[PDB]
């Protein structure tokens, strides 16, 4: 269970082809739909994780 959770949590640090691993960076850097493009990559990656 520790190996599973410390993988599930550590996958939050992964980029999945977005501009950053941390969602607040995207929301504080880009705007309009160009931000949501990167958010959909993070959603798909974190969801599959």
């Amino acid at each position: 269970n520790a190996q599973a959770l410390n993988t599930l949590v550590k996958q939050l640090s992964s980029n999945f082809g977005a501009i950053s691993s941390v969602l607040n960076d995207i929301l504080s850097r880009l705007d309009p739909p160009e931000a949501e493009v990167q958010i959909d990559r993070l959603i798909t990656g974190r969801l599959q994780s």
Binding site: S28, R29, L30, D31, P32
Partner: protein
Amino acid sequence: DYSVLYNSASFSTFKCYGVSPTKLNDLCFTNVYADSFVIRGDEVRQIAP
């Protein structure tokens, strides 16, 4: 600041790559390098990342 630059000279092309132009006054600039060069009008479209 860029809002004090419209009164001195009317900019014909103000496009910011990788950052929104309306979010420049909401962040903090870091290491601003001025790269000025005069080229032909038929070569401005080639200058792009």
